[PDB]
Design a protein around this ligand. Structure first.
Ligand SMILES: [Cl-]
Ligand SMILES: [Cl-]
Ligand SMILES: [Cl-]
Ligand SMILES: [Cl-]
Ligand SMILES: [Cl-]
Ligand SMILES: [Rb+]
Ligand SMILES: [Rb+]
Ligand SMILES: [Rb+]
Ligand SMILES: [Rb+]
Ligand SMILES: [Rb+]
Length: 164
């Protein structure tokens, strides 16, 4: 297990534009296109992202291409974020994946707002951090994925993803 396999379990793979758990147009492996309710707006974003006329449909290779971009950019952005960088660097490589997963789902700003949980993670107070992470819109709206992510933070193991 690694970050790519983890996010592929959590996000799935779809080759046509669809609506994510928040109702927003998405494609591929969790590639958010737009928060606009306009499918045309989402289609324009898609064509821009891939560099061709897709009218809402991509290939698996294209989906994987966006996915690696998105993972790479989530890591890079964490390392440029003053709140998230120290936490990332303090964590072992398995727990780092949980942090990347959260950024992939809710964005850097949203994760950086988890001030108290971030502190508990930096302190290696794993059970306390796990309790705190669950007191969130995040957990309420996607509880089973949040549980997996939280278990990864709490344990530093892949037990919540072996075998999905
Ligand atoms: Cl555009
Ligand atoms: Cl993009
Ligand atoms: Cl603890
Ligand atoms: Cl708490
Ligand atoms: Cl869920
Ligand atoms: Rb998804
Ligand atoms: Rb997403
Ligand atoms: Rb719509
Ligand atoms: Rb580290
Ligand atoms: Rb905050």
């Amino acid at each position: 297990m690694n970050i790519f396999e983890m996010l592929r379990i959590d996000e799935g793979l779809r080759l046509k534009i669809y609506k994510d758990t928040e109702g927003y147009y998405t494609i591929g492996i969790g590639h958010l296109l737009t928060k606009s309710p306009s499918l045309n707006a989402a289609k324009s974003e898609l064509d821009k992202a891939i560099g061709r006329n897709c009218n809402g449909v991509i290939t698996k290779d294209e989906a994987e291409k966006l996915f690696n971009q998105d993972v790479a950019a989530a890591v890079r952005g964490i390392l440029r974020n003053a709140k998230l960088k120290p936490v990332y660097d303090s964590l072992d490589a398995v727990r780092e994946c949980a942090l990347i997963n959260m950024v992939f789902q809710m964005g850097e700003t949203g994760v950086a707002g988890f001030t108290n949980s971030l502190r508990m993670l930096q302190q290696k107070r794993w059970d306390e951090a796990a309790v705190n992470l669950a007191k969130s819109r995040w957990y309420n709206q996607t509880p089973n994925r949040a549980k997996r992510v939280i278990t990864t933070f709490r344990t530093g193991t892949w037990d919540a993803y072996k075998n999905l």
